[PDB]
Short mmCIF file of C-alpha atoms in Angstrom, two decimals:
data_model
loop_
_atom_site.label_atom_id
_atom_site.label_comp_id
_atom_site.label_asym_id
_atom_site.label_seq_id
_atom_site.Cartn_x
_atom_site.Cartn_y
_atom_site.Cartn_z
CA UNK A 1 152.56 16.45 -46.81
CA UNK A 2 152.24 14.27 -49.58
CA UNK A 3 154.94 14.69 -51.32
CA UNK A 4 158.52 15.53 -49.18
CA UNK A 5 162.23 15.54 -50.29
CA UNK A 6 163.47 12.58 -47.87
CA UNK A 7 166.51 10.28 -47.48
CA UNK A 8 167.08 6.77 -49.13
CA UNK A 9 167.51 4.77 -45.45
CA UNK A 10 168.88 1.13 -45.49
CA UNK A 11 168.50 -0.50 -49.24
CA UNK A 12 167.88 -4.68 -48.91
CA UNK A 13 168.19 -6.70 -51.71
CA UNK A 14 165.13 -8.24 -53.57
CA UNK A 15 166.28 -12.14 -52.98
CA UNK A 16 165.99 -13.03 -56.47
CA UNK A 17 164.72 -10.19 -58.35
CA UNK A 18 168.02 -8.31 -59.25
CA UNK A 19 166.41 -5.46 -60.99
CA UNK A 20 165.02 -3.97 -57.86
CA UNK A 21 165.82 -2.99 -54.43
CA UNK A 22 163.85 -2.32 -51.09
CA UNK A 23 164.69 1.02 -49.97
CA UNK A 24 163.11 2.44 -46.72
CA UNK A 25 162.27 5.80 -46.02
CA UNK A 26 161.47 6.67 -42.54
CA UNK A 27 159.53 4.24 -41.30
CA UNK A 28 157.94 3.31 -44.58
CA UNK A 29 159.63 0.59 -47.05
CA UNK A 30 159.68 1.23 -50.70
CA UNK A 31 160.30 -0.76 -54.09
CA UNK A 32 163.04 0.94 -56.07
CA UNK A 33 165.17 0.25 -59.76
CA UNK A 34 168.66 -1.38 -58.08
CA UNK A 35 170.77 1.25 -58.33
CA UNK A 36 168.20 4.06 -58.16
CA UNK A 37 169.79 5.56 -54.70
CA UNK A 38 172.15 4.34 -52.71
CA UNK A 39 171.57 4.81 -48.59
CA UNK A 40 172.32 8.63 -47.80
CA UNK A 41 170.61 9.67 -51.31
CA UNK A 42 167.61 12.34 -51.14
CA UNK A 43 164.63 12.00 -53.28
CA UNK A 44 160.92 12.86 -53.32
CA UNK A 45 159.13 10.64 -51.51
CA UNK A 46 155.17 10.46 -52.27
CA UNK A 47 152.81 9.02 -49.99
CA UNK A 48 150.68 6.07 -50.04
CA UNK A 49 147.01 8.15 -51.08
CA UNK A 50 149.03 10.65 -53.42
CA UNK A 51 146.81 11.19 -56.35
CA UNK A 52 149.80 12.13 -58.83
CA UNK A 53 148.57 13.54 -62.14
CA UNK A 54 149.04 11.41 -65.55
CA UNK A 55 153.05 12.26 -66.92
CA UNK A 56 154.87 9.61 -69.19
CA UNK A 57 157.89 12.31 -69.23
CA UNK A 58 158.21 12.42 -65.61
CA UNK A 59 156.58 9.43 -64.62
CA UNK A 60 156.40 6.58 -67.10
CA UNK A 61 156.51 3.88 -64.44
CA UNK A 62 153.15 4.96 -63.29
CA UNK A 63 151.60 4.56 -66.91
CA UNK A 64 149.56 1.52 -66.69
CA UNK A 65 147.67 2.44 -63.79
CA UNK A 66 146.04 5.99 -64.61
CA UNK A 67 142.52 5.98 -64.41
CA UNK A 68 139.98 8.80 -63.76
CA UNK A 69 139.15 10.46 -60.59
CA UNK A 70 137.21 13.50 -59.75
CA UNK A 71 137.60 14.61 -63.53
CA UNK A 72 141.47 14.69 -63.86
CA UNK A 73 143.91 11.87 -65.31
CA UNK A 74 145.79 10.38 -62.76
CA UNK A 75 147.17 7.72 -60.67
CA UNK A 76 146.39 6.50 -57.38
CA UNK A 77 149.97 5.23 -54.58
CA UNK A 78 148.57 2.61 -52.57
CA UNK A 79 149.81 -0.26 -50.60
CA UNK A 80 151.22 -3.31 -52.88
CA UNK A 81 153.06 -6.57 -52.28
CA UNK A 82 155.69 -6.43 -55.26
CA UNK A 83 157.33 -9.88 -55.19
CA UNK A 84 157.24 -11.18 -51.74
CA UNK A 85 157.76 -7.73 -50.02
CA UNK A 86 155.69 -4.84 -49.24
CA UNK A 87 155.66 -1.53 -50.99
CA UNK A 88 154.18 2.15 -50.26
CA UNK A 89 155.13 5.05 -51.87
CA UNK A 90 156.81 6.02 -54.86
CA UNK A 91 160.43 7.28 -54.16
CA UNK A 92 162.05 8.80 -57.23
CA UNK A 93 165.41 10.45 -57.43
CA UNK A 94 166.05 14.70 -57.01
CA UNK A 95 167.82 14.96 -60.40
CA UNK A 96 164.34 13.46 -62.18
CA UNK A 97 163.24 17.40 -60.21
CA UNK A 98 165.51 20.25 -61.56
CA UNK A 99 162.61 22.84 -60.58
CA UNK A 100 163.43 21.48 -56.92
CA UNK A 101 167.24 21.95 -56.95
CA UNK A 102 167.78 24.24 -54.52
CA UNK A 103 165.26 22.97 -52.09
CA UNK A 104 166.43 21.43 -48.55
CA UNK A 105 165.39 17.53 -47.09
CA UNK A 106 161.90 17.48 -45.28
CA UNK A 107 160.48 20.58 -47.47
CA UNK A 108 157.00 19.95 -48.74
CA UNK A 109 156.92 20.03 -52.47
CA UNK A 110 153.43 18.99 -52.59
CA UNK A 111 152.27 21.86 -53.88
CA UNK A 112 154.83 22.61 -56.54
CA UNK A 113 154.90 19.74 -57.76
CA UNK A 114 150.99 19.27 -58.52
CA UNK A 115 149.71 16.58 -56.07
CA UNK A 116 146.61 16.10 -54.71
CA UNK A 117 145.02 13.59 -52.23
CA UNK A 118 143.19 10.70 -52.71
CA UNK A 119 140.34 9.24 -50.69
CA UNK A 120 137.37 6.66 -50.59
CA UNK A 121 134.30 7.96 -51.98
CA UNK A 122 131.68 9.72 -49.44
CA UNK A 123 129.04 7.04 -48.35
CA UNK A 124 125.96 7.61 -50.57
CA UNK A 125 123.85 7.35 -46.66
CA UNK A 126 125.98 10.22 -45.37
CA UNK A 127 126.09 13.31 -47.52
CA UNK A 128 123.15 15.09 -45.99
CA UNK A 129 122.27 18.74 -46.72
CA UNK A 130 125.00 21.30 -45.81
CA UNK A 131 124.01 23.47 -43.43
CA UNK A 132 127.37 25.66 -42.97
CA UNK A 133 131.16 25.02 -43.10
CA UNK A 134 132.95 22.96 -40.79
CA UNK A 135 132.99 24.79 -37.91
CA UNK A 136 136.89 26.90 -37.37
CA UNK A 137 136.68 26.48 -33.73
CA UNK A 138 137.27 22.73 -33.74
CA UNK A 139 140.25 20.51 -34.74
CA UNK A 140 139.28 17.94 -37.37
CA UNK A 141 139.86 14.50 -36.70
CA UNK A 142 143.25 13.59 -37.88
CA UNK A 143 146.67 11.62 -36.72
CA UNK A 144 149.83 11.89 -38.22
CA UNK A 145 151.21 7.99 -39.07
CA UNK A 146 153.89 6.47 -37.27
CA UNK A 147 155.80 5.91 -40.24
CA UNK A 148 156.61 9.45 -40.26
CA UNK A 149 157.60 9.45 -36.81
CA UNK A 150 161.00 7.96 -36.07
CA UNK A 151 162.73 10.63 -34.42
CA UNK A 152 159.69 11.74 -32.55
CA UNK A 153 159.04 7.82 -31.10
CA UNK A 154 162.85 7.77 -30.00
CA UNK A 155 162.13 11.24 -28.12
CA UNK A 156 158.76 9.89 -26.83
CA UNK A 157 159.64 6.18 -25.40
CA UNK A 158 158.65 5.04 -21.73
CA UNK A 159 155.75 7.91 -21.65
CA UNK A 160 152.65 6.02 -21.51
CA UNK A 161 149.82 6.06 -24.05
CA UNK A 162 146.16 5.28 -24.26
CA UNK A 163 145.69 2.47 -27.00
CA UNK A 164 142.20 2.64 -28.67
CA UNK A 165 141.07 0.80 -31.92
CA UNK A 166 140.73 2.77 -35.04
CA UNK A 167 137.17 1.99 -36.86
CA UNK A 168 136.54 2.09 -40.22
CA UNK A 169 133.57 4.26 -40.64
CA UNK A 170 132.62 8.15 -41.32
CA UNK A 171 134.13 10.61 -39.18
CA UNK A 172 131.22 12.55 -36.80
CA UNK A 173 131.30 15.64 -34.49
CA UNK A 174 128.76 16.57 -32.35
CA UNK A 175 129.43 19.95 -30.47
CA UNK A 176 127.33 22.70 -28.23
CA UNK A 177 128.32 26.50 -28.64
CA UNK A 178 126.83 28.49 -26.40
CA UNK A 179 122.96 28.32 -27.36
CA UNK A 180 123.90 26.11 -30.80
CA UNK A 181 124.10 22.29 -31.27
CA UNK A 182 125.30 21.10 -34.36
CA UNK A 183 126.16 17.93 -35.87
CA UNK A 184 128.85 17.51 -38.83
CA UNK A 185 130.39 14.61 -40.91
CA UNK A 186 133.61 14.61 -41.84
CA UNK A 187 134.18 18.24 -43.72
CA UNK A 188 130.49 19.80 -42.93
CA UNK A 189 128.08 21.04 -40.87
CA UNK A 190 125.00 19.17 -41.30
CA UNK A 191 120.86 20.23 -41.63
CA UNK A 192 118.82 17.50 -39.45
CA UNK A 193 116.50 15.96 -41.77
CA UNK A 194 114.51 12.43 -40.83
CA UNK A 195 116.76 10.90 -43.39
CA UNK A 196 120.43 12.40 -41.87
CA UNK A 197 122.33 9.49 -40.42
CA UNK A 198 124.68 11.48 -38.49
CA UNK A 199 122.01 13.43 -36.89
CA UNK A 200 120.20 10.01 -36.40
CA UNK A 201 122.85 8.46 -34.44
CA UNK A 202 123.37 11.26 -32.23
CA UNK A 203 119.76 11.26 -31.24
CA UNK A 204 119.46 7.81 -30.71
CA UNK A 205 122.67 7.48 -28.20
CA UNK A 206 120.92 10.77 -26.42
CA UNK A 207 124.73 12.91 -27.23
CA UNK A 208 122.65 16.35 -27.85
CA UNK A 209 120.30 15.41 -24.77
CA UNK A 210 124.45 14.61 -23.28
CA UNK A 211 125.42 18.15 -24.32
CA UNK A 212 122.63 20.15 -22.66
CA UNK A 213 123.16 17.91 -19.41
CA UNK A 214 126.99 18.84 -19.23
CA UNK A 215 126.35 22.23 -20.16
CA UNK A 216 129.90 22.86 -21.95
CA UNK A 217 131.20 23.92 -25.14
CA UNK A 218 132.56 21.05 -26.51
CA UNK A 219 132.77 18.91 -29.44
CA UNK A 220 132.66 15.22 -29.33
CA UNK A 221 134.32 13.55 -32.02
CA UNK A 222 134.25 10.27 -33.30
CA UNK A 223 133.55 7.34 -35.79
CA UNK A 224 129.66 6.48 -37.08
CA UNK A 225 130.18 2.72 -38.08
CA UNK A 226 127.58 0.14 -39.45
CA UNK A 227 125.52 -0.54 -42.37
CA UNK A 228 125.77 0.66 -45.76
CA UNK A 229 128.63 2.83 -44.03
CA UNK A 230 131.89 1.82 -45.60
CA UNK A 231 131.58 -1.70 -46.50
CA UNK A 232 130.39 -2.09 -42.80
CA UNK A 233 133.71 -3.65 -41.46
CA UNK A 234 132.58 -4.79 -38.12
CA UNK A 235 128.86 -6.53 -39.38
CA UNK A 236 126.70 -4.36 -37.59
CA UNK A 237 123.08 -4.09 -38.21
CA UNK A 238 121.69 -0.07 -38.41
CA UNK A 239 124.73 2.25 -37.58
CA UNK A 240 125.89 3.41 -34.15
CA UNK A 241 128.69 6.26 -33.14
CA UNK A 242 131.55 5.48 -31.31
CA UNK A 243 133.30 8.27 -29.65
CA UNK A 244 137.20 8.55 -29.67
CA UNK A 245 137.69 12.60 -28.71
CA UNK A 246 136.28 15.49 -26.95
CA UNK A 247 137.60 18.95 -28.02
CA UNK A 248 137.19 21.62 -25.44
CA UNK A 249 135.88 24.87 -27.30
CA UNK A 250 136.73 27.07 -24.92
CA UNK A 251 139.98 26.47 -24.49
CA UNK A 252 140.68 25.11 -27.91
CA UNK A 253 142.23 21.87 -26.95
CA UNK A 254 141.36 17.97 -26.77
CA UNK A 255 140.76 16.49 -23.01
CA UNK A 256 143.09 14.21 -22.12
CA UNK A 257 142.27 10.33 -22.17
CA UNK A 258 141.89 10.20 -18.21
CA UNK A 259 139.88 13.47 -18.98
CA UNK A 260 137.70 12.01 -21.70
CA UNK A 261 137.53 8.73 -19.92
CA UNK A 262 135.90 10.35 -16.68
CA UNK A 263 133.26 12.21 -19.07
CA UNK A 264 131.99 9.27 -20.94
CA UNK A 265 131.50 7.54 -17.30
CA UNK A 266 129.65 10.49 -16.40
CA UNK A 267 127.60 10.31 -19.59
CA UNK A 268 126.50 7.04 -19.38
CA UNK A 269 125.95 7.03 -15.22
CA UNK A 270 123.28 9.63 -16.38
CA UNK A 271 121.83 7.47 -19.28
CA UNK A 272 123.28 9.12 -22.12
CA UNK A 273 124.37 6.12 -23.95
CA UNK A 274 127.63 7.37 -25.41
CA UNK A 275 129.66 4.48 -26.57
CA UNK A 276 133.47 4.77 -26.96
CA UNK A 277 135.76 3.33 -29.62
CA UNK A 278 137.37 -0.06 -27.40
CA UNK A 279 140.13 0.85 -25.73
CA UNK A 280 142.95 -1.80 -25.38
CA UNK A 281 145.60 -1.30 -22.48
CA UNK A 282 147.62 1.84 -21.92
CA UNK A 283 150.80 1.10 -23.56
CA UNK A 284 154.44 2.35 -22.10
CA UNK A 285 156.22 3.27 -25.31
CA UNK A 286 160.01 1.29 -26.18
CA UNK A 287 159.17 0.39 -29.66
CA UNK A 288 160.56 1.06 -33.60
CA UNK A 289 157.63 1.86 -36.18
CA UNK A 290 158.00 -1.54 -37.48
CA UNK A 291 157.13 -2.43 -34.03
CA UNK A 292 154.24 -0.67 -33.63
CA UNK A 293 152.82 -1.50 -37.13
CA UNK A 294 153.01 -5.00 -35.91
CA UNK A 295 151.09 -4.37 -32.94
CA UNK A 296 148.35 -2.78 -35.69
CA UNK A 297 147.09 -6.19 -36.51
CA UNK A 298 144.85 -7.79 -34.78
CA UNK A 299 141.23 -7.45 -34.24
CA UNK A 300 138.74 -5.17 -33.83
CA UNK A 301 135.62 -3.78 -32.26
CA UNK A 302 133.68 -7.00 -33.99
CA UNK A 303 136.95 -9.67 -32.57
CA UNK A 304 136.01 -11.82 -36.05
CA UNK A 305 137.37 -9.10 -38.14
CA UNK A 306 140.90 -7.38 -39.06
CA UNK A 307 140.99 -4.20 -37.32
CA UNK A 308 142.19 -1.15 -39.57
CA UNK A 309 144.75 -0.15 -36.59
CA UNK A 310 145.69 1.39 -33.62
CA UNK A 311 145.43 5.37 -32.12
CA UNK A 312 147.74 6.10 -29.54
CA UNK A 313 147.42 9.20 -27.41
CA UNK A 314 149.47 10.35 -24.72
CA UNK A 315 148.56 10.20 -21.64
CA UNK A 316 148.78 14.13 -21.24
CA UNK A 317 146.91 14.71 -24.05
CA UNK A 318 149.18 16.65 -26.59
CA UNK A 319 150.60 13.89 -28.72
CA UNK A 320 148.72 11.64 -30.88
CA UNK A 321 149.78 9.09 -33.65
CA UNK A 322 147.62 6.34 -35.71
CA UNK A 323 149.59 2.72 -37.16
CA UNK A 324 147.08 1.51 -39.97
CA UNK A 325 147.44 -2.09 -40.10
CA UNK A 326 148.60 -3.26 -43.43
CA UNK A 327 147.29 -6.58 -43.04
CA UNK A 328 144.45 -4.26 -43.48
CA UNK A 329 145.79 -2.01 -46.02
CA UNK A 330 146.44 -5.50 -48.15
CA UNK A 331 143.12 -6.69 -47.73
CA UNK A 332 141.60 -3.82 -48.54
CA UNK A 333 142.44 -2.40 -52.11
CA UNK A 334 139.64 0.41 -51.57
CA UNK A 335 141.86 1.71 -48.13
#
């Protein structure tokens, strides 16, 4: 959903700059021309990580930054601080869209309109050999940001929510089927060679030795964090894997956090040494966005280091959201 027709919110001036405006959009707050929109106005909004392909005609303000990435000319929306505020996005105007005229406000016009995601290169330790795709009977490990979840955190506020740090690492599953154990990184099933960190880490902590014990089909899901992983956020020496999910095959659905909590006891009562991403306190929900980007900050699994945000999962176990920290996000020019 890169790319969506949205709705100019409130539009702040630029104290001193009086060619430009701060517009938000949904929870997200956006440099604009003064002028551009006025509060009420639609417009595609792209996303922070939109990789939007080089166009002087349509997109001359994005000139100076093309570069090249995965052979096509392009540039690359990430967080800025344009002149004391921050930026993310790009929010241009319908009428700069006639193809899109007769579209509606929250259609997706990613694909029409040619734009592709960006993300930070594969870690050179962690692209093993590919055994198989990853695997359709399990979710992938992704969260919707709260930026694009006003409405829904309105609907949602009092119900409770386990809090857990977000690490910045290399995404890892390790599931049983039936009489198969497999390991995967992010978008793969992976072959266990002596050099495959994934399969490595999943040794080491005693997960597969976990699986056989408990004897289900499930996938455990979760961050591998450390050296030469990353940029290695946290200072860790060798790598480890820190478990935020388990996915229940069987019934095609995540255990709750009471339900994953009570597992991961289990686990480690047994000596399977499964650590867990930290996990802050449960959190009763009466915030705005802005709110709950603030709580993002802070620190993280290492306390000496910016964390790069928050998860927060309802305590049911059927509504998730992530808040990236963009004291992070500013810090980090490769995030």
């Amino acid at each position: 959903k890169l790319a969506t027709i949205r709705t100019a919110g409130e539009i702040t001036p630029i104290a001193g700059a009086e060619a430009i405006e701060c517009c938000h959009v949904d929870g997200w707050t956006c440099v604009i021309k003064k002028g551009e929109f006025k509060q009420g106005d639609r417009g595609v909004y792209f996303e922070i990580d939109s990789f939007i392909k080089e166009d002087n005609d349509r997109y001359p303000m994005l000139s100076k930054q093309v570069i090249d990435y995965e052979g096509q000319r392009g540039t690359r929306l990430r967080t800025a601080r344009l002149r004391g505020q921050l930026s993310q996005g790009l929010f241009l105007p319908m009428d700069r869209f006639p193809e899109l005229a007769s579209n509606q406000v929250g259609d997706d016009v990613t694909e029409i309109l040619g734009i592709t995601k960006w993300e930070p290169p594969i870690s050179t330790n962690l692209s093993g050999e590919i055994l198989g795709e990853f695997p359709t009977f399990i979710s992938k490990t992704d969260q919707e940001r709260v930026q694009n979840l006003i409405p829904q955190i309105e609907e949602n506020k009092g119900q409770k929510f386990e809090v857990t740090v977000a690490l910045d690492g290399s995404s890892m599953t390790v599931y049983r089927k039936d009489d198969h154990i497999g390991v995967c990184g992010r978008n793969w099933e992976l072959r266990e060679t002596a050099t495959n960190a994934q399969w490595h880490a999943a040794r080491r902590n005693k997960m597969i030795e976990g699986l056989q014990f408990l004897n289900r089909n499930l996938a455990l899901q979760g961050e591998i964090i450390g050296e030469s992983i990353q940029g290695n956020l946290e200072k860790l020496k060798g790598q480890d894997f820190y478990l935020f999910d388990i996915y229940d095959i069987d019934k095609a659905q995540y255990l709750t956090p009471i339900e994953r909590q009570s597992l991961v006891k289990q686990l480690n009562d047994n000596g399977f040494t499964v650590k867990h991403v930290p996990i802050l306190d449960d959190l009763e929900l009466n915030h705005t966005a802005e709110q709950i980007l603030a709580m993002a900050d802070g620190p993280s699994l290492n306390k000496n280091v910016k964390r790069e945000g928050l998860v927060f999962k309802r305590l049911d176990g059927k509504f998730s959201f992530k808040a990236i920290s963009n004291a992070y996000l500013e810090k980090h020019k490769d995030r």
